[model samples]
Target chain A: ADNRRPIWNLAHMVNAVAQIPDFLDLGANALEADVTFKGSVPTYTYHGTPCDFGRDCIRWEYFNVFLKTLREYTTPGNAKYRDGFILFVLDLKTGSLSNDQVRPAGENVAKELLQNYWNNGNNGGRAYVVLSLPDIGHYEFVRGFKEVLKKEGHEDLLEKVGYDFSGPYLPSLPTLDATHEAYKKAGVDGHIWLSDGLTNFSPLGDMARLKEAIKSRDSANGFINKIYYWSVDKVSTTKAALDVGVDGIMTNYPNVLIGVLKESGYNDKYRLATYDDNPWETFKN
Target chain B: ADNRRPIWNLAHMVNAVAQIPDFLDLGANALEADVTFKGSVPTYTYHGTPCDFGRDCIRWEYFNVFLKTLREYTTPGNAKYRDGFILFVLDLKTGSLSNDQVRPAGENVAKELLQNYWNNGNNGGRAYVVLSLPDIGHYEFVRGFKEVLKKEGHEDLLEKVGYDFSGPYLPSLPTLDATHEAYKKAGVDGHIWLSDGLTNFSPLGDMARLKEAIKSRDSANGFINKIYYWSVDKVSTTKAALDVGVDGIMTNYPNVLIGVLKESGYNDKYRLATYDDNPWETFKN
Candidate 1:
């Protein structure tokens, strides 16, 4: 009776392709992602500069091509495979395009491509949608876009989608404190995930400390359930951040962390709950 | 407040030299040697065959060079260093040299060297001498040699001497048992240190097994006080042997073992008694 569970079965994100076969070859469970958009009018302009020309374009094409290629590769399954969820990084900042022409044009590309992917049934279900916001202030832009979907009688689609905001990266702890208050005031619940460029050790610690500070500030308010420790190998100092008890770690070396978790015995029931339909499941199966 | 003692000190053997300062350093304690002359001496047959060279020449040269070097190196200021002991190997089994020829030759060289190094006013002191037989049956040879030294009016040297009749390497435990009885019959007391190239791991359980065997063989005739685990690394494995209740460990790394003893808080009064001089006086001066 060899009763040992592999560590990869316990993570929320798989992080790399090289580690996939170790679990798949051993018949372990896993999950992963892809992104799409459905029926949202594409607008492209913001406060003047072209968004897609720089950082925005990188994030958009990265997830878009990733999803497209992943879907095509796994469909035939020469490798053992499974499926979990799909995530779309939606650009809701395009409505600010009215004020800036080039920004609007760039945002429109993200908005239209995502809407096109969603309506075409590429993502399988509404629960798979992941909206990427430039900032939490852009939540109104998302809400406004959802109003257009609602008027078009696609409100069921908007209800099932999740929001990933960017205000968590505010430079000052006091500003993060203020923006978190505003995020709650905007009626974003715990279901809305937070995304931020808070990647370095000092900033990661700043964000963690701010979150703790904000929790003490308002007992009635709670933030997103998950946050990522991006670029795992570069983030050695942040290993103890999980000791502060963050819900997730996003890393290039997810398998290494999986080994650490196995040695230290960390459990994640949420990951098990969402395993079956994940993109990583294709490789694991 | 850092109060850790170093693992090694002056009184241990310098097994390896690490730096220039350590060159020409003396070992923590002086080394003891046991000399024995054995093996066959060839004979010349006039017509059948020619005689081959035996090791007697080599043995004589070894002692000649050894004693001459000892005399040349000794200085009045370092008189303490010149005091060393010797045990003669007697009772030849098969050799070309007659008993009379061998005994007289050995005595002539030993007496001249002893007088040159010690009895002469320029030399230190008379070296302690002993005669050892191969076994009980060879006791008369040792008694004969003792008579020669006494007839030379060196009878006072006999007082400082001792005897052993333990034969060559014993193949079986029972042979060692018989040898021990033979040693007792020849009026020997205390343990006679013997060597057979034993290692830390080899004869792994033999020490404990030997203890049990010795007790069972002759509990009434037992005279062995200490079992020395000699020529070992002394740092890692010596503590384990000590826990097995051996009285002493003869090691190249005695200083390291002493560090272990001090760190383990052993306050035994006899711990410092066996090395060079009194350890307390050595430390105080």
Candidate 2:
């Protein structure tokens, strides 16, 4: 639903040329961006490795601008979801998550961002956080993710941010099952990006198999993980996902999906809905 | 996708008290309603023959009221969806589309519904139409449907409104393929309500094959048909759908499916996105 149609992984989210408002109209509900740290401060970069040349390799903008822009569309109607709150997948490039490593700490950098806009009145109730810190693939990532939020007095944002497990496409059933088993054993609950041609580290698997495996082997406080296809530029691939019932999809080109969805007659089904919250919590069972 | 958890299909729609807002939250994106003709006027009914007993058996409501209710949610934000725009599956009664008497009249009934609210700005850009007029399955209904809409100055809605093929769930692969060929040959582009346990009407087969056939032999104005599992309220049935990779699932309780979706870790992927709409339309290719 979220990623199936047109999840635009705009590596250039803060390109300045494309304002936050421009994106709002493009119809991309979910977006992806890369972040690198300035020793103690956080900054958004564009590439895998940053250029030591003063955030030049970066998008030439601070991450807060995104938060500031997202706040513009908050609705009094539903706190669970702002009418325009989009899912931003953040990639952290700062190697340190420790307070002792730096003066304030890596987590503190994120804490400042969350607290300033999230906890108080800024954009607190608007767009939530989704951490794509792959290092969090380590169980301690989840532990540290929680510990930092609690220590910084931003525990509320703890529930706001979840770990995502992304990877390349399975290509086969056996591979899908194996990945499912691995992710289930790891206990990292978040978004799983399963794409066609890409790279994957640890904590990977097919969503169906992984979800089913997790279902059978649930530990205390088990987090449910959603499935997504990364680097999806093909209509056939999207069609295959809809055909196979994959959860979400991500791509460099967002509008292609809208055209695809409209042509396929799912134009309205996949469009964004209101509600600040993801309305997916298990209903009153 | 459609019927898994929240697809009510309660037929309580068109009920006087429900209005349109109440329908917005019922949690179904698709609906199936029974329509009857009250002498010269078309009415929404639910029995073998209307006792002409008012609109009591028919949610004690009129057919046009549904149009009114659907129009309420079409807004600049999420209300358009909340306004109760959904994929409608209409069931026509009265058996007047035959060689008995009427030539271009039976189709006029549908044309009226489309002309009034459908072709108008009311629900035009909102949710488009998908018809299940079984009599149209015989082909004559389509001509009449088109003739009336064209004559009534609703050619756009007539074009917007398309045919959908629905049937019970398929138990085997060959059966699915056979039906696909049949649908392809007939050019009946729409959704296949593949339900389990229930019996299928004329020309049936497995969903996968039917879908594949329709996909390959697509039409000029091809509508990518979605595969749905109807009559499913059980977790086992839903799980089986996932295992088989069906396009969508319809059940009395869509939450059960959502619960299933969550446990399988798709809490948000299948959920809708917000609109400042970055609908992910393509910019590159």
Candidate 3:
């Protein structure tokens, strides 16, 4: 009953360790944190504009602790365990950093994840992670992640992670097609995600463009594994997003969307929130 | 009784050579073109999303012709000459080009402007140009433009052009401060324009941030010469922009803003349309 909707995201501002349970209890399966790399590691989860690294951002170490806590919930026989999968989305914020620096950050983040969360098959196929890199478009970040994992002898766990190329504009058809070509040519295939919104404002939003982007065949062509419409906080837009057949709807109000989904008879589509096993591992199953 | 209330712009889609007069006559003192570099030249004026160059864009040569026509209007004794200065804003579209390539494109554009329009003291100090480069932040484009002009011995004409660092996010206060420092360190101080909007939507548009950005000390510290609010076509928004005291307002409907300025008694602030001499060369004079 708790799982019937697009991948429910407790959007930005879910940065701390203690803030996790309240959101997960509110039926949010996915939690997003805005991360900025300090030196060689993903060190801060900051959403503040003109981010002052050490001063303004919360420590990404807290997120590491949060991941440890999340592991507890995903483990079977634990009171907090649910049948559904939990998603951790790391929104990589490349403030003014050039692309050359961004690739290293990606590799560093993958290493951090492997060391802390994905080591020793720690996720039990029950947890999925997405690294949302808005900069460096040429699959470089994902490739870097793969390189890190392969180097660390954990390349088999690559399936548990997804790389998202989301930015100011929705991915265009040509871009999507080219992205597919680029990824295939690069010989890296794993979970891929793209983001857009439902509004007509700005370049990427608006129904016509939204429909075309969602309807693109390249979405399933190994480059784009999932499409997520972002920041749909209201019930009306949530319904519109669901109707549009997106793989996920990122929203601030998961409780509201849950209610709407139940009333609209979309509850049958729910993934069971049982910590016993990962029902969501099968895409749209 | 012609000019008033901000340097009015007939924003995007004003690409065709024939569309110039209608806008110029409608009290618009500024024209904007979206240019993409094809090969080494500033080739096309395109706004189409996922712009396919040559297929969708209008030729920039027509804009070259526009300069020829504009020079006639700027000439002292011509019937078409306007007393006020004319502003040309080239919104440089660096679709997917790297910063290294963007610098060369900027230099090429400088050469194109010098050869076609600004050659032989051609602008007569009556025409101002703004190269709005959204990509490549570190003053590279402007530096390249300077390099080209200095090599050709027309570096004195640098005063006639402004370099704008307008992008998706409004330039943050820290960014603005840093921009000032960078430009000073680089020793390049020509006209520097910044842009934002008055609405509470998006990252940079809200009233508080807008006020802070406009009120920044760096703006006056030889880095940001003018602040132009973008795409404000409505009467209410136009009034709000006027109240906010932006140097210019870019809009699709110049006719609407002209009406608003007149109704608000802002027409007293009008810049005369007599092509006899340049009245707007002085900043907000």
**Best lDDT among the predictions, by candidate number:** 3
| Per-model TM against the reference | 0.33, 0.36, 0.63
Worst 10 residues of 2 chain B by lDDT: B276-285
Docking model 1 quality class: incorrect
lDDT string, candidate 2, B1-285, tens digits: 322322222122233426334433544444445554432245543322111122222243456665544444443354444533444545444332223212233465555566545644354435544454332233444556667766767666654454533321111223444444434544444433332322232234434344454343334443444444554566787666644544445544544565556564343333322222111111110
Off by over 4 Å in 2: A1-17, A39-41, A48-58, A73-82, A94-106, A119-125, A136-142, A166-197, A200-223, A265-285, B1-285
TM-score of 3: 0.63
Order the candidate numbers by DockQ, best to worst. 3, 2, 1
Ranking by lDDT: 3, 2, 1
Error of 3 at A8 (Å): 3.9
**Model 1: iRMSD?**
49.1
Report lDDT (Cα) of residue A247, candidate 1: 36
Q: Candidate 3: DockQ?
A: 0.05
In CAPRI terms, where does candidate 2 land?
incorrect
How accurate locally, in lDDT, is each candidate? Answer: 0.35, 0.43, 0.58
